[PDB]
A paper describes a structure:
Coat protein 1 (COPI) coated vesicles function in retrograde trafficking between the Golgi apparatus and the Endoplasmic Reticulum (ER), and between the Golgi cisternae in both retrograde and anterograde directions. Coatomer (the COPI complex) is a heteroheptameric protein complex, consisting of α, β, β’, γ, δ, ε and ζ subunits. Arf1-GTP recruits the protein complex coatomer from the cytoplasm and anchors it at the membrane. Polymerization of coatomer at the membrane assembles the COPI coat, which recruits cargo molecules and membrane machinery to the assembly site.
Crystal structures were available for the majority of the components of the COPI coat, but not for the βδ-COP subcomplex. As a first step towards a complete structural model, we expressed and crystallized a complex containing β-COP19-391 and δ-COP1-175 from C. thermophilum (Ct), from which we obtained a molecular model of βδ-COP comprising residues 20–390 of β-COP (‘trunk region’) and residues 2–150 of δ-COP. The right-handed super-helical arch of β-COP wraps around the δ-subunit. The structural model of δ-COP comprises a longin domain followed by a β-turn (117-122), and two helices a (127-135) and b (139-150), which are part of the linker region connecting the longin domain and the μ-Homology Domain (MHD). The stretch of residues between helix a and amphipathic helix b traverses the β-COP α-solenoid in the vicinity of helix 7. Helix b, including isoleucine residues 143, 146 and 147, projects away from the α-solenoid where it would be accessible for binding partners. Helix a and the first part of helix b are present in our x-ray structure. While no electron density was visible for residues 151–175 of δ-COP in the x-ray structure, our cryoEM map of the COPI coat has clear density corresponding to a longer helix, and we modeled residues 139–165 of the predicted helix b into our density. The sequence identity between the βδ-COP from Chaetomium thermophilum used for crystallography and Mus musculus used for subtomogram averaging is 53%.
Residue numbers in the entry:
A (entry chain B): 2 to 151
B (entry chain A): 20 to 390
Write the structure that this text describes.
């Protein structure tokens, strides 16, 4: 499962961090701090194991998009999640500069929460995610009209 | 200090401006300083707002603000917060309910959860799958962190599960049930066991997850699990096939099973476009090979099929694994393939293939030395 997601610097500093499951954010920030030494080696280009976790990650311009997972997590699925997260970030921020990500931070976290709840993922398209975030509800619109009715 | 300025922003703001204030408040807090005198301002000028975007910032603040005073007792303001949450748990907007339910999965203070329980329980029977999928996780979460609040949670979820039609709610339901009640998840699994091969991917994944758990607690079900797992080697998604092959080796040292899982891994290395995935499953093949010397030698020509990936790292890994399986029985068949690859690097993409071509010449030279 995906314990947490982070966009972070190549030096191990979180630009944003979102814990989904069984992990405090402070613990996330500590894992990321030790992350760059595992990643900068040509060990693998996508995954490194450190502590009792695995980092699934890709470059995001000069940043890193990073999922933290337990070591038994389905890695094929987690690479697909990572791509989906990366696609969200690019579609949401005008640029992939740190400052611009920071501008869209809380929007980015709300989107991440549409994808992962408690570590598990939904097979959502970017369109469904955009739709969820819009929060347009027929019931809500219909209830206020039933309201003004009475 | 800066608190005052914030406080003034909440007092005089509108929805649009308060959204920017709440964003500053959040950033300030996460980065270090908790703004203590703010709670009551947020309750007064943010919570009664109707702006959905602002409401999400509110719950983000609820996640991080301190709940307890100096004497380890819940702050009084959160009585007012609970009326707010209980209203959001009853909102016409399905999304608000879903977002509020996600939040409750993070709440730990029983004194906050207790006045919300009836509303949460009601959400299990909402018409909208967006609400149901979040409520069943909420219920399992309350029970994990505060069992006395809902001692019948395992029964609730079981019931939720028996009538559920939404695949995402079915997946969440089974995950939630098994996280709090092995036995009742087991019974549920038994009723659906014959249809697992045509279950949806997500549910298939957690069903496999659970089967590994029960194979250890109840080893008498392990053969029926093994047969089912073999069948899942032919699943339609690559995630499930990967999950079935990882589990099958985890349950038995049997060479038939090992070779079978190996072959599925090799099929993935061939089928999947992502070269990092190719490298990952190749290392699964490699490790099986180390722990079972001999068992996979029949798959050597399938390994070599991976060489039709244009990536030099994929090509290098495939050749290493293959060379560690070259025996007298197959060396000539292997060298003929290598040469045929070598010939193709002269005709196709001569420049890009320079590194690969040298690697082929080297591997062919290896085969000569080994014999």
């Amino acid at each position: 499962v995906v314990l947490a997601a982070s966009i972070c610097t190549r030096g191990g500093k979180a630009v944003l961090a979102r814990a989904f499951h069984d992990i405090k954010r402070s613990r996330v920030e500590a894992l990321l701090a030790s992350f760059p030494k595992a990643a900068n080696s040509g060990t693998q280009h996508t995954t490194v194991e450190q502590d009792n976790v695995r980092f699934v990650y890709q470059p995001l311009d000069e940043l890193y998009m990073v999922l933290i997972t337990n070591k038994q997590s389905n890695i094929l699925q987690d690479i697909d999640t990572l791509h989906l997260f990366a696609q969200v970030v690019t579609n949401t921020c005008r640029t992939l500069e740190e400052r611009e990500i920071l501008r869209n931070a809380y929007e980015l976290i709300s989107a991440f929460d549409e994808i992962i709840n408690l570590g598990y993922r939904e097979n959502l398209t970017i369109n469904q995610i955009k739709t969820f975030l819009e929060m347009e509800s027929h019931e809500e619109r219909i209830q206020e009209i039933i309201a003004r009715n009475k | 200090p800066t608190l005052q300025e914030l406080k003034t922003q909440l007092e005089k703001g509108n929805d649009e401006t308060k959204i920017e204030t709440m964003k500053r408040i959040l950033t300030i807090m996460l980065n270090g300083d908790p703004l203590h005198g703010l709670l009551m301002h947020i309750i007064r000028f943010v919570m009664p707002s109707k702006s959905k975007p602002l409401k999400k910032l509110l719950y983000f603040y609820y996640e991080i603000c301190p709940k307890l005073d100096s004497q380890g007792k819940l702050k009084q303001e959160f009585i007012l917060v609970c009326n707010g949450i209980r209203n959001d748990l009853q909102h016409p907007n399905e999304y608000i309910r879903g977002n509020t339910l996600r939040f409750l999965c993070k709440l730990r203070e029983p004194e906050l959860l207790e006045p919300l329980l009836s509303s949460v329980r009601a959400c299990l029977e909402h018409r909208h799958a967006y609400v149901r999928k979040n409520a069943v996780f909420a219920v399992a979460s309350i029970y994990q962190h505060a069992p006395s609040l809902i001692p019948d949670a395992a029964d609730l979820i079981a019931t939720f599960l028996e009538g559920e039609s939404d695949p995402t709610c079915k997946r969440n339901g089974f995950a939630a049930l098994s996280s709090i009640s092995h036995d009742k998840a087991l019974s549920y699994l038994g009723t659906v066991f014959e249809g697992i091969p045509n279950a949806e991917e997500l549910l298939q994944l957690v069903e496999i997850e659970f089967i590994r758990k029960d194979a250890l607690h109840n080893p008498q079900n392990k053969p029926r699990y093994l047969r089912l797992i073999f069948d899942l080697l032919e699943a339609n998604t690559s995630t499930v096939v990967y999950e079935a092959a990882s589990s099958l080796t985890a349950l038995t040292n049997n060479p038939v099973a090992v070779k079978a899982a190996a072959g599925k891994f090799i099929e993935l290395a061939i089928k999947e476009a992502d070269n990092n995935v190719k490298l990952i499953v190749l290392d699964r093949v490699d490790q099986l090979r180390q722990k079972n010397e001999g068992i996979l030698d029949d798959l050597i020509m399938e390994i070599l099929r991976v060489l039709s990936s244009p990536d030099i790292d994929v090509r290098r890994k495939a050749l290493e694994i293959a060379l560690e399986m070259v025996s007298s029985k197959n060396v000539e068949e292997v060298v003929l393939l290598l040469k045929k690859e070598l010939s193709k690097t002269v005709e196709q993409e001569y420049e890009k293939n320079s590194e690969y071509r040298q690697l082929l010449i080297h591997s062919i030279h290896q085969c000569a030395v080994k014999f």
